[model samples]
Target: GSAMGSKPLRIGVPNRVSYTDYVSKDKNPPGVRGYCIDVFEAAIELLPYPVPRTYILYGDGKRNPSYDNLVNEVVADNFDVAVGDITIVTNRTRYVDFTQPFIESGLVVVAPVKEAGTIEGIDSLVTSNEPIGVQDGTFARNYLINELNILPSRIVPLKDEEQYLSALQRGPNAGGVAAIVDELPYIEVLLTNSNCKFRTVGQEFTRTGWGFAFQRDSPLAVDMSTAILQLSEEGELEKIHRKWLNYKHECS
Candidate 1:
């Protein structure tokens, strides 16, 4: 039998839809694309040696996947590496390895264009009688209730991106919530697509970052980590961000 190095590396990616990481629907050979994919490809370009690879989709292909489950796949050896907006956390480090972070991320609030600064801080969130929208079962929701002690009734549990944006645009007077709370990256996605309808409010909180995952002790981990740092220093990372996320037009 040939050595393990001879086989094409199995790279698992989330098959869900997010503005930053989306699965291509009708492409031949099947593929995933978006901001995370851009960073991954750019990192690989810096590698000195050829690394043969295959992209495997892991999830139902419409909603965001369970990152914990993807980490478990790496631990089980189902994938040589996993990429796509995977956050680096202390607990997941116990089961798998992560590359140097590609993006520093955090949570923030988004409100309608007309009322952007109405909720500017945690204290402001409590004072506003208008309902705040948060995707149910997400960190944003937990933070509002558990961390900030916001009243449950004042929090409207939204279902997904579509709902969050729609409810936010409607505003409280029109049956929508006052503002929508979510991760910084996701909020960027919304604002980029909002056509000046929304703007982020308040300072970012709950610092974290997105990193690629690998099996523990995998040699690929070190190389990719170095590549990430190299690209970051060289400013390729920023160019890639502008490529995918630069605003199409300025808002008023």
Candidate 2:
């Protein structure tokens, strides 16, 4: 019998991922639900060995948890694997292994529609004093500072859409940002609910994918990646995304 089959796997998940992962009180036991969990459970079912697992919410009941610390938890042997909308990036791969990406994600900017004039695009972040909001630990934040050459001072690091959305509505002059840079899926969720108040401007600026995190050299990484690839080949990935990400509204 393999060691992996001997005990329950400790699976760490983010407390919230918009529609991707979150607690659902609708359940009798009030367990986690969402696309990420659906995808994870589906992939696990395809595994050759049955894996008994426990879903532990990352950040210990805090809002907007630090993903960096979540990955470090796996290094610290706190969790066998970390799942959810975790991005597969170079720096993170150095310390932990990541399964093949389950979803394609890239950066996009959402801005309020101007009542009077035309929009100046993302380049203005460098040319103007208008502040831009980004989730504190997301790739969008790094992209703004590292690639766009935008000053961190001009970047407002916030937690969730609730905080940033209110700030975005306030405009740049009143302790708010002129725009927000976030991932496509997240922006889609925002734009869906923004009632045409905001729009996704310009094309996605980068190409990346989200994946699960595992300990370095962990055999589960290889196994899970294979399952994810299988799902991709079977079109389950697309189907799952569509099932959960059916955006009903679009801003003009």
Candidate 3:
């Protein structure tokens, strides 16, 4: 383990939603200062041997690198693993490995709070002509078009969910979307801050969870998963969850 002393194990953290709140590189101390940060740190530090680690924030502050790009960073032997609010879906499993999900989450539909009056449930999104916003690379976009049959014309692809919150605020008249569908944890975090008045429109769907990614059968995967088991048992993991994500996404 000391073979490469002080060579920080590069951990890739995407600029996805809740990323800034949970783990921003711009923040000082330059180490595990966020939720995922601590989870990874705890797992690695507990290893019998010491291994140094540092988080590398991917993408501009606004948009996250595509999952393919983020996963490739690990598969190509750049970063040791990819950790973020990244979901553990099947297609991603085909490339790198995923540790057991540390938190529960799912997809959701949201719109500006004022529009809540016009939003007659989930049906309003598909039937209306106003624009809809979704992250460019996430499944939420495909989930809307293929599964929900939302017209391509109404779908506005944005860099990330935070950007969508901007369009949702713009309202339909200013090229803002009338509705947005994204991951629940992200929506929940944004709603927690009164800066924006976005509100959920429908129930969460397609239940999923977040996991850290490693190269196929990478030893770190086992190490991180073991760390999760310990953190969960000690109640530290849930404590981190409550600190960052303890909010109901429903309208105020």
Clashes (candidate 1): 0
Each prediction's whole-model lDDT (CA): 0.76, 0.76, 0.74
Model 1 agreement with the true structure over 1-252: per-residue lDDT tens digits = 865657788988876555534322226553667778878888988899888887888877656566678878989999988888776766688988899899998777777767856777556766887788875434455567787788878888765678878898788889898887777877776776777888777788668888899899888889999999999999998988877675556663
TM-score of each: 0.79, 0.87, 0.80
**Candidate 2: tens digits of C-alpha lDDT, residues 1-252:** 555535678887776533443222124332566777778888999899978788877754435567778788888899988888888766788989998889888887778877114444666545666788887556567668888988878889876667868988898888998888888878877777778888877677778888889988988889989999999999998888877776687444
Residue-level lDDT tens digits of model 3 in 1-252? 457545777888776543455555654656335677767676677677777667887776555557667878888889878887677876788888899888877887788768887864557767776788877656666667788888877888886545767788887898788877778777776677645577788777568888899889888788778888888899988787676556653444
lDDT of 2 at 238: 84
Whole-model alpha-carbon lDDT for candidate 2? 0.76
Q: Which candidate do you rate higher for TM-score, 1 or 2? A: 2
Worst 10 residues of 3 by lDDT: 17-26
Q: How far is candidate 2 from the true structure (C-alpha RMSD, Å)?
A: 3.1
Residue 58's lDDT in candidate 2: 72
